Design a protein around this ligand. Structure first.
Ligand SMILES: [Zn+2]
Length: 47
């Protein structure tokens, strides 16, 4: 039970993929080991 993004799996502290904007790989551990930007995914307004 739970169809939202409130505690997916403690994955909010990625470091930084080297590719960055030029990253065209699709791996399961890559999306969780290295991020591709620097923005939050939940606190962007606070009301
Ligand atoms: Zn990457």
């Amino acid at each position: 039970g739970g169809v939202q993004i409130v505690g997916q799996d403690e994955t909010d502290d990625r470091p930084e993929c080297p590719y960055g904007p030029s990253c065209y790989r699709k791996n399961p551990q890559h999306k969780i080991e290295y991020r591709h930007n620097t923005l939050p995914v939940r606190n962007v307004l606070d009301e």
